């Protein structure tokens, strides 16, 4: 189906102690493939997926220089933003940046994005047309006016609509055995009696890729929400994901409840029932 | 690959 490449950048100021901590990661869909950590000893962009190992040394030289240039800009932004909000020099603050591109099932351009956050709140973001900006407050309006006069949206649009889509297609081809292979969830249910009249039914979904999935509980066919607990999708650690949904049902009425699992790797939706 | 060096805020 659809696909996406995304890059994440985080810079945390450590005033008085040195340069900001800088961490950068790259994702194709739900798979990380590159990383950089300013506290690592290599001081280089590093691979994190097997299909990116096919890139020559000039790839890693280019990505290392560009990723360090990102950290230099964030280093100055932390100082600039500190002055925009009249903050003190002794406090720690965080800059976050995310951008990338989505493609459809035909691998043609679908949308691009470029977003920026200060201290975990929206600061400025590129709009859908990739030609204008959304400023979240007065301090960001100064950035918006600066970035509009410099026409930096033209440069980003050329990357998001061109370079970004071209390399996403290349990665999907070089990693077709992993990025294009779907992993259906392996499901099972557990039963635990919390008393002599109620029981907990937990519907499990393990070892699936990609991470998108929906678990819904139904009683006699109608949806259920009360006494239903749903946990966030979590990484298993091997490239696949896990998720479970639980419900507290009366004893002797377990056969009235059904768990419905929907995932790309499933030809038809799964239906789970305890007896 | 990622984008080139960004403009400062």
């Amino acid at each position, epitope marked *: 189906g659809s696909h996406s490449m995304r890059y994440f950048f985080t810079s945390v100021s450590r005033p008085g102690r040195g340069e900001p901590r800088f961490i950068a990661v790259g994702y194709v869909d739900d798979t990380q493939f590159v990383r950089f950590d300013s506290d690592a000893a290599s001081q280089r962009m590093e691979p994190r997926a097997p299909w990116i190992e096919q890139e020559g040394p*000039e790839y890693w*030289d*280019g990505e290392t*220089r*560009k990723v*360090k*240039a990102h950290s*230099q*800009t964030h*280093r*100055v932004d932390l100082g600039t933003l500190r002055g925009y909000y009249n903050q003190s020099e002794a406090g720690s603050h965080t800059v976050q940046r995310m951008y990338g591109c989505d493609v459809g099932s035909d691998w043609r351009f679908l949308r691009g994005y470029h977003q920026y956050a200060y201290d975990g709140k929206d600061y400025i973001a590129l709009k859908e047309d990739l030609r204008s900006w959304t400023a979240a407050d007065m301090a960001a309006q100064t950035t918006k006016h*600066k970035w509009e*006069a*410099a026409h*930096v949206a*033209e*440069q980003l649009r*050329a990357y998001l609509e*061109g*370079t970004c889509v071209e390399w996403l297609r290349r990665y999907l081809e070089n990693g077709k055995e992993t990025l294009q292979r779907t992993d259906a969830p392996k499901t099972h249910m557990t039963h635990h009696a919390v008393s002599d009249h109620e029981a907990t039914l937990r519907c499990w979904a393990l070892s699936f890729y990609p991470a998108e999935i929906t678990l819904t509980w139904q009683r006699d066919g109608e949806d259920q929400t009360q006494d239903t607990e749903l946990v966030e999708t979590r990484p298993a650690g091997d490239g696949t994901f896990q998720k479970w949904a639980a419900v507290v049902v009366p004893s002797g009425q377990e056969q009235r409840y059904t768990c419905h699992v929907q995932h790309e790797g499933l030809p038809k939706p799964l239906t789970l029932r305890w007896e | 690959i990622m984008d*080139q*060096v*960004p*403009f*400062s805020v």
Partner: T-cell receptor
Amino acid sequence: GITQSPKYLFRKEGQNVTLSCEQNLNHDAMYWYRQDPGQGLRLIYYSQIVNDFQKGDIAEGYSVSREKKESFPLTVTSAQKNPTAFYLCASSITLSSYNEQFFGPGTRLTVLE
Amino acid sequence: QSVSQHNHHVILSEAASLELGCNYSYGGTVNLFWYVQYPGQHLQLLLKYFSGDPLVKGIKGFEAEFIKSKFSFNLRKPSVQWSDTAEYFCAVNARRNTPLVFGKGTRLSVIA
């Protein structure tokens, strides 16, 4: 736009001279070039952003600083033994390939004894 | 990285065709520029390849052709003028956080 030291200037032996270069274009990147007759433009120093500068191909004998965003002063020390040279300052929005460089008028520096 | 302008000095009569070669040694994607330095004036951008059409129109009837396979960005003008007498610089940027690289330049003399 970009302004730099007067179109002409001279120095004496054993003396250091600082060439100023300023821009109100809100540009992050600034550059210093030396234009030699048969060699074209030769990069001395470039500054990707404030507080950051890197050596060019002929950085020997020169020093720079970037304590402010607007200014990129080039200092020609006495170790630089060229009797005459033409220095160009430039700036761009960023170091990105999409941003062209705007150039100052230039400066002729002569050794006058 | 280097940029090669093969003609060091070109002397042309008026209304003749101009063809200034430019080649670069970098092997990835690039952006390309042509600068002109008229006598007594500073360097100013003549044209640039941003994206899209490899045939790039410029000011004063100039046109350049970006050929990815030949790593060339030759500058052309069908009918030169006397006012075209200047120095012409080719410039290429390699998109890896490295500064723009200029060629050695080509001096154009247009016989009045």
